[PDB]
Amino acid sequence: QLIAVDEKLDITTLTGVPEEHIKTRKVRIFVPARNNMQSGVNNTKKWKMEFDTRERWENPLMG
Amino acid sequence: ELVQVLRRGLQQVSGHGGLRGYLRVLFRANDVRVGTLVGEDKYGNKYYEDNKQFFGRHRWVIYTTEMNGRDTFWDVDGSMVPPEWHRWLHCMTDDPPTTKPPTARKYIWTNHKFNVSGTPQQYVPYSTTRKKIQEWVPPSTPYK
Amino acid sequence: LHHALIPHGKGGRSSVSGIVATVFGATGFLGRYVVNHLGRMGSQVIVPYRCEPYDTMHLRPMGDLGQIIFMEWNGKDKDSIRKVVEHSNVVINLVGREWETKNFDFEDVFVKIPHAIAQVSKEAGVEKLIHISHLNADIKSPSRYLRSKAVGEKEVRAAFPEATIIKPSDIFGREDRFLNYFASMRWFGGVPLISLGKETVKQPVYIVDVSKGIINAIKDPDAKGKTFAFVGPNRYLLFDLVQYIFAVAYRPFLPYPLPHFAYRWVGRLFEVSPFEPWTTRDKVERVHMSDMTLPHLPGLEDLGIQATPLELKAIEVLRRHRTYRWLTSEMEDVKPAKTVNI
Amino acid sequence: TYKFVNMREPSMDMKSVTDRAAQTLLWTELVRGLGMTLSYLFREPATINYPFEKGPLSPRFRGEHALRRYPSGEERCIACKLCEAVCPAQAITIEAEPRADGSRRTTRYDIDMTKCIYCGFCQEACPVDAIVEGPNFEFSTETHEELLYNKEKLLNNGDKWEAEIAANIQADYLYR
Amino acid sequence: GVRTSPTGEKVTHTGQAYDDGDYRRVRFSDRQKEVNENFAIDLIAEQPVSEVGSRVISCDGGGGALGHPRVYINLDKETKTGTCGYCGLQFRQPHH
Amino acid sequence: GTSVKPIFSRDMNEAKRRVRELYRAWYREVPNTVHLFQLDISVKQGRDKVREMFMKNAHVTDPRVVDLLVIKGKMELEETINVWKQRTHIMRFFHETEAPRPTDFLSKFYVGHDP
Amino acid sequence: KVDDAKVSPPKRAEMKTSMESLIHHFKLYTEGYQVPPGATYTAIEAPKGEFGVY
Amino acid sequence: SRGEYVVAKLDDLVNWARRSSLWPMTFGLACCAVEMMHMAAPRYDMDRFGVVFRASPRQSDVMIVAGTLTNKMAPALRKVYDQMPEPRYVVSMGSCANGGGYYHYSYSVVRGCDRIVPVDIYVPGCPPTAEALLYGILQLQRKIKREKRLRIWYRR
Amino acid sequence: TRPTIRPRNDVVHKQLSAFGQYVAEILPKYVQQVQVSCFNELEIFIHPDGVIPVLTFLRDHTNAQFKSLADLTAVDVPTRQNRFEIVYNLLSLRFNSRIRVKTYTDELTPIESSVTVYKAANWYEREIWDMFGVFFANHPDLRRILTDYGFEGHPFRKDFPLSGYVELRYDDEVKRVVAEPVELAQEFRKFDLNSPWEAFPAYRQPPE
Numbered sequence A: 001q002l003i004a005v006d007e008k009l010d011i012t013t014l015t016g017v018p019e020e021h022i023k024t025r026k027v028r029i030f031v032p033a034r035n036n037m038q039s040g041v042n043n044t045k046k047w048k049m050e051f052d053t054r055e056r057w058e059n060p061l062m063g
Numbered sequence B: 001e002l003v004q005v006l007r008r009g010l011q012q013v014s015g016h017g018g019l020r021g022y023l024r025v026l027f028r029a030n031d032v033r034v035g036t037l038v039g040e041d042k043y044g045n046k047y048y049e050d051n052k053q054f055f056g057r058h059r060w061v062i063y064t065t066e067m068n069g070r071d072t073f074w075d076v077d078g079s080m081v082p083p084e085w086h087r088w089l090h091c092m093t094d095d096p097p098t099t100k101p102p103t104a105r106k107y108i109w110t111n112h113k114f115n116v117s118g119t120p121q122q123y124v125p126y127s128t129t130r131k132k133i134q135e136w137v138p139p140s141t142p143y144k
Numbered sequence C: 001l002h003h004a005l006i007p008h009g010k011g012g013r014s015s016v017s018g019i020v021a022t023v024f025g026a027t028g029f030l031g032r033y034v035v036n037h038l039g040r041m042g043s044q045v046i047v048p049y050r051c052e053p054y055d056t057m058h059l060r061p062m063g064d065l066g067q068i069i070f071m072e073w074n075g076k077d078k079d080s081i082r083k084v085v086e087h088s089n090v091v092i093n094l095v096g097r098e099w100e101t102k103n104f105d106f107e108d109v110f111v112k113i114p115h116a117i118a119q120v121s122k123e124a125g126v127e128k129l130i131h132i133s134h135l136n137a138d139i140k141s142p143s144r145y146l147r148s149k150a151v152g153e154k155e156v157r158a159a160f161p162e163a164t165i166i167k168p169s170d171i172f173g174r175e176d177r178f179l180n181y182f183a184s185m186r187w188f189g190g191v192p193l194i195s196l197g198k199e200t201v202k203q204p205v206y207i208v209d210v211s212k213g214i215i216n217a218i219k220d221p222d223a224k225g226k227t228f229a230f231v232g233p234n235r236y237l238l239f240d241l242v243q244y245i246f247a248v249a250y251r252p253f254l255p256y257p258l259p260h261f262a263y264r265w266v267g268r269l270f271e272v273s274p275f276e277p278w279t280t281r282d283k284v285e286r287v288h289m290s291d292m293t294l295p296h297l298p299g300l301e302d303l304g305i306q307a308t309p310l311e312l313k314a315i316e317v318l319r320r321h322r323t324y325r326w327l328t329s330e331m332e333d334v335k336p337a338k339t340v341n342i
Numbered sequence D: 001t002y003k004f005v006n007m008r009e010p011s012m013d014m015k016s017v018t019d020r021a022a023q024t025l026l027w028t029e030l031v032r033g034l035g036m037t038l039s040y041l042f043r044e045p046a047t048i049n050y051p052f053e054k055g056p057l058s059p060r061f062r063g064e065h066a067l068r069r070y071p072s073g074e075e076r077c078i079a080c081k082l083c084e085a086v087c088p089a090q091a092i093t094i095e096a097e098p099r100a101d102g103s104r105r106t107t108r109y110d111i112d113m114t115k116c117i118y119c120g121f122c123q124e125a126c127p128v129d130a131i132v133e134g135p136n137f138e139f140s141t142e143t144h145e146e147l148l149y150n151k152e153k154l155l156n157n158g159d160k161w162e163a164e165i166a167a168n169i170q171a172d173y174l175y176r
Numbered sequence E: 001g002v003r004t005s006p007t008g009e010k011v012t013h014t015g016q017a018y019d020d021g022d023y024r025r026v027r028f029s030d031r032q033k034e035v036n037e038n039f040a041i042d043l044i045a046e047q048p049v050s051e052v053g054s055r056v057i058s059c060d061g062g063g064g065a066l067g068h069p070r071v072y073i074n075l076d077k078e079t080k081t082g083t084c085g086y087c088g089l090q091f092r093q094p095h096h
Numbered sequence F: 001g002t003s004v005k006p007i008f009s010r011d012m013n014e015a016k017r018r019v020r021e022l023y024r025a026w027y028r029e030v031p032n033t034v035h036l037f038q039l040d041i042s043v044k045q046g047r048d049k050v051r052e053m054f055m056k057n058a059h060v061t062d063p064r065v066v067d068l069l070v071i072k073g074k075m076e077l078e079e080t081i082n083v084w085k086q087r088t089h090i091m092r093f094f095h096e097t098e099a100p101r102p103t104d105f106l107s108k109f110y111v112g113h114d115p
Numbered sequence G: 001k002v003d004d005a006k007v008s009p010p011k012r013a014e015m016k017t018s019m020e021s022l023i024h025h026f027k028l029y030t031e032g033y034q035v036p037p038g039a040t041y042t043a044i045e046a047p048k049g050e051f052g053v054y
Numbered sequence H: 001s002r003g004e005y006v007v008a009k010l011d012d013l014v015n016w017a018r019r020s021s022l023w024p025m026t027f028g029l030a031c032c033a034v035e036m037m038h039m040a041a042p043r044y045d046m047d048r049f050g051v052v053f054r055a056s057p058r059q060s061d062v063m064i065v066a067g068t069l070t071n072k073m074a075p076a077l078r079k080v081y082d083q084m085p086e087p088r089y090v091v092s093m094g095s096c097a098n099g100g101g102y103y104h105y106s107y108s109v110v111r112g113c114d115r116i117v118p119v120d121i122y123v124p125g126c127p128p129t130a131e132a133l134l135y136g137i138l139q140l141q142r143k144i145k146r147e148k149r150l151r152i153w154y155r156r
Numbered sequence I: 001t002r003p004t005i006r007p008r009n010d011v012v013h014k015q016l017s018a019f020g021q022y023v024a025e026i027l028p029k030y031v032q033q034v035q036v037s038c039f040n041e042l043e044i045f046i047h048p049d050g051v052i053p054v055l056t057f058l059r060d061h062t063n064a065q066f067k068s069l070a071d072l073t074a075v076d077v078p079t080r081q082n083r084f085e086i087v088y089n090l091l092s093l094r095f096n097s098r099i100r101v102k103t104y105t106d107e108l109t110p111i112e113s114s115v116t117v118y119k120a121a122n123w124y125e126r127e128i129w130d131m132f133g134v135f136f137a138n139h140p141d142l143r144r145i146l147t148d149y150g151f152e153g154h155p156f157r158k159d160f161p162l163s164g165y166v167e168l169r170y171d172d173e174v175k176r177v178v179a180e181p182v183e184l185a186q187e188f189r190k191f192d193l194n195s196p197w198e199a200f201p202a203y204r205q206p207p208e
């Protein structure tokens, strides 16, 4: 026997992700463009989820 | 056969240049065996061999008392062995660098250096690439 | 701002804060906290040390790789100071003893060394100089420690006019000589107090508060040539403070009055130890003076810091001084002491 | 096919029973163990006299890394970045650009020795025998930073160990 | 071909040297800077051009299997020599 | 009907009942945790932290998610009672070595590029 | 090793002589070989018991 | 002076005694500890140098971190390092201990033991050979021989 | 073919196909699919409600006797509505055979615990809960097995970052090990390795 919940799915509280990384982040859902250097199309089949690019800096040691 | 081993001990005492050399080698290496000299370093390390010993004790080195800049009468380490005698001493080959010298090159260090950690000669890492982003330099003259 | 000295990152261990700091006296009580706070945000910290390197080891895990550089220095040799301050934009001075040795008196460590450091820093182009003085620093003080402190801050302001002088008052912490001093005085049975400690008022300050104040003074642009007084939120009569200290440690409090000359004689008797003295005449003097009130000076609240009360952090120092029977007693058990707050 | 390890029964004759009782009362097998240890006492020990004597190694031994040169003194590395791609621990960092004479050479070549797993995959991937794992293993340091090698350090290691490295490669290259 | 910067810091073969106002120089105080003195560009410039009497030459770096992948170099241009893209040796047809 | 199998609770009321039971258990536990782990915080601070942790998830309306949250809270409490957690794990709830990160626009603009 | 240069790398002498060997060495040490889709559970009698990989 | 000579001789005596009697804790984490077992094996026989394993932290002088330090393990390692009486030393052995090594980018691995405890000697290798660890131990002995506690106290 | 190619075994393939037909006939209520792979491995895809019956039948039936639970694990496929793929590997010593049983679940639907069928499942189920977040109903003692105390999240999920969210270091001001947001001196370098040319035509999918 079933309970028939009537709300949209939401599992954010169960994933252990910090709040900053849930609300602030923007994801791109896209089929990656073909690499213009090659003619193969096998990398343009599936959809990809990626996150927005954040800051990268230089390490004071080793650069 | 007891007299034989005692005479062998006396022979080991006498074959190190007398009593003083015997005590010197005993307090410098905790070992008093006598073996056939194979060669000597330009830094002063001597290499001895005795094929009658078991594998691992058949080749050994008496280190020098003065390497590049430090006194090694007591403070010795395995990093004081030059690469050719390093290859001979670790049994990667059966041929000493005396009979089989290494190939000479113009970029090979003529002077071996030991482990220089803890000394002002220690290696300090740094980034070897140039600056990436170039900044705009404002003019040196007033604008009005 | 010299691009390599531009802040980068999130403000963490691997980030860049843009601070290159030379912390004199970083191997002591305040120095370890200051170095920890500098290394948390990703600063480049230079530690000049005269002691054996084994005594600097606890400072190693305080920064990322390459962010803490240890160098030998000599207080009487200006070349060492110049060598250790060549590439720094911040110089913090925490050098100081609570006793006099056969090689360094109070003038050596509170006047000559700070003046040499400040002059070398000014000639080396160092931008910021943080110097530590005492709240009770006074030219006409009965303590040579405080007279030397006053002369030293005068000379430091002379040599480095843009220097920032910070005047704390009896810092208390895990490795202090304030709570541990009174707690260890239990080994002699009774607690000797001049005038029963009824004519002395203390305003002790937390160690983390002082370190955060130093960091905020480094990062604050208006605190260049100011003088700050770092004090705690409450003022206590010495008798009540010591009674509270013994209460938190769960040790029997047996106070008795001692004449000033007798306590001075006791301090002189303890001064003969070739090792770190248990107490000194200067310490006996400084313990029994009321903390000065300087309302004209900016405090911790001007640097965005709310001073931590002693009643919130006394257990983390005094739990070590308890017996096995009282180790698990809670912090809210021991009846906060009465405060003479104006 | 199998065998039993603990499926034997003892004979119950008076001879065997008396022998077992004597074993219980006079501790014969304990004396056997004592005799075994006593036998080992008079044998020659297997200890070697380090650092004056060393354990044996092989030409294939994977030790400290080194960057090599051609006999003219030119660097073998061509900045192809195969070693960087193959590295299981991402210990290699490479940056390159055309040299002043238009040659394909590295500007940055770092190996994080505290990331390295010393697997030898980099010298397998190298097509010009530029990067190798040398015979050295005695290079312990006192600070972590000393184990973050850059191009200069690796080139110095090559210049210092080339005499042994070339001999080991000469002895081993026909198996590769 | 080592060279000293205006501050005394050695300039490495990649042309890297800290500026006078760079704090990172403090990492070399009481210590040294690791610079390899055998600049490969000068050493390969010191190598003489090899005269060969064919239009196409073959180079493998010497040592056979101990060199680099074998490549073929065209020498039709008399203006410039033919350089190996791996080892940097130069080849040329007879002229003058 | 969305054809959803429950975990423990048929609907929201039983979920709130389980939440209340877990809250009672944590509220009882806090003084014993302060005594045993030798914490420099007070019992009031610990109960405030428990209340804050419970209120962090106050927006959940799915009974299954509440059920799993109660399961995780029971796991945490069982870890704390058996002293499987250490003082570091207990005090990780308080974040004392982390600097307070500002929330207004201008401070974020000053420090860096993060939104 | 299996005489299939799309799985096992060629000998270093072949890689420095033949174009196909160089291409296969490059691609095997940069990208690696592609494994056809599928799942396997493989077990061996390791000295400590059954050691398996799914 | 006479006092300088006396304190130098006393420093020599104490340094010799401390470096000639080094007792590491019985403490190992992973593959590297196996090589540690080979450093006590008859071929190398670290006991001949005066190096003896002792289980109690209270009776140990050196901590050899032989293996990967995980987040679950870091408080335990810190605890048993703190319970070691002073003077005490830490030897970091193998890639995982030195900087994380093969598991540097993991979610459950401490990127080097120097984030938890101060380190005196770093022994590279995955794992370092028993000879390499013996070289590290002898280097630590030399570093102890360089100590000048009593001279520093005298010049204070 | 010959030397470089793996040989085929048709006998085992036919035997496993026959036994898969047998099992599917005996339990139509739960068995959704049966497969035999090219390297002779039998897989049975079942409904989640049939975990305890099917497994029990495989352990206790005279003709199955799959008495050993070799491994139990989960696979995460984020593109599926039912995220997690629960895999049981069973060994039968009497018939010298191996079988695999696969079911599915999502983040919020529990899977029945199998400890009453195989005791070996106990820790295995714990590990799944620790690594993927799949809850197992009626598990005698369900808690984390592999992660640190108080660890938040399930690391083996595909959307979990490789280095996680927090890292540990000792702090001298508080005199203890503390956790702080991750910062890497060197960031892990992502590599794009997939070739843009198709490798295996036998697995080509319809172009939709």
Ligand SMILES: CCCCCCCCCCCCCCCCC[C@@H](O)O[C@H](CO[C@H](O)CCCCCCCCCCCCCCC)COP(=O)(O)OCC[N+](C)(C)C
Pocket: B027, B028, B029, B030, B074, B075, B076, H009, H010, H012, H013, H016
């Ligand atoms: C009398 C009761 C109270 C006092 C108790 C003490 C009893 C006397 C202590 C005996 C001391 C003997 C120690 C000396 C042995 C040193 C041997 C030599 O090797 O030392 C070298 C140099 O010597 C040391 O530098 C100095 C050691 C001696 C210090 C000076 C003597 C001070 C004596 C003062 C006695 C006062 C006692 C207290 C009185 C109240 C360093 O060599 P090392 O690197 O290791 O070996 C390398 C290992 N190799 C060879 C295998 C490669």
Ligand SMILES: CCCCCCCC/C=C\CCCCCCCC(=O)O[C@H](COC(=O)CCCCCCC/C=C/CCCCCCCC)COP(=O)(O)OCCN
Pocket: D024, D025, D026, D027, D030
């Ligand atoms: C005519 C009348 C004369 C009078 C009678 C005299 C005759 C006496 C004959 C019997 C004498 C027996 C003496 C032995 C005493 C105890 C032996 C014994 O039976 O105990 C063993 C156990 O003894 C041991 O195993 C000892 C264990 C510890 C061993 C420690 C090292 C071994 C000793 C090394 C050499 C000893 C050197 C002794 C002399 C030292 C110099 C003073 C039984 O134990 P279990 O096999 O487990 O069986 C019990 C259930 N039935």
Ligand SMILES: NC(=O)C1=CN([C@@H]2O[C@H](COP(=O)(O)OP(=O)(O)OC[C@H]3O[C@@H](n4cnc5c(N)ncnc54)[C@H](OP(=O)(O)O)[C@@H]3O)[C@@H](O)[C@H]2O)C=CC1
Pocket: C024, C025, C026, C027, C028, C029, C030, C031, C049, C050, C051, C075, C093, C094, C095, C096, C097, C098, C104, C109, C132, C133, C134, C135, C167, C168, C169, C170, C171, C172, C177, C178
């Ligand atoms: N403690 C308190 O309650 C408050 C502190 N004061 C002042 O705050 C400053 C720092 O405080 P605190 O950390 O508690 O003091 P500490 O005694 O704990 O630290 C003293 C530091 O100064 C160094 N030092 C001392 N003498 C010399 C010297 N002759 N040459 C070189 N270095 C020396 C010490 O190095 P080494 O380890 O080698 O000895 C050590 O690093 C001090 O200037 C103190 O006077 C201000 C108000 C009170």
Ligand SMILES: CCCCCCCCCCC1=C(C)C(=O)C(OC)=C(OC)C1=O
Pocket: H026, H027, H028, H029, H030, H031, H032, H033, H034, H036, H037, H040, H053
């Ligand atoms: C006296 C004989 C030498 C004992 C060496 C003690 C080494 C201590 C490391 C602990 C340890 C032990 C005991 C051990 O047995 C083992 O193998 C499973 C480990 O994994 C490598 C260990 O780390």
Ligand code: SF4
Pocket: D083, D086, D087, D088, D089, D090, D091, D092, D111, D115, D116, D117, D118, D119, D120, D121, D122, D123
């Ligand atoms: S030996 Fe292995 S881990 Fe080390 S640099 Fe080479 S490929 Fe990378």
Ligand code: SF4
Pocket: D076, D077, D078, D079, D080, D081, D082, D083, D084, D094, D125, D126, D127, D128, D129, D130, D131
């Ligand atoms: S060392 Fe070899 S593989 Fe690595 S970049 Fe240089 S030439 Fe390529």
Ligand code: SF4
Pocket: H030, H031, H032, H066, H067, H068, H093, H094, H095, H096, H097, H101, H102, H125, H126, H127, H128
């Ligand atoms: S460094 Fe290598 S051998 Fe040592 S514990 Fe780590 S993985 Fe194992």
Ligand SMILES: [Zn+2]
Pocket: E059, E060, E061, E068, E084, E085, E086, E087, E088, E089
């Ligand atoms: Zn060439």
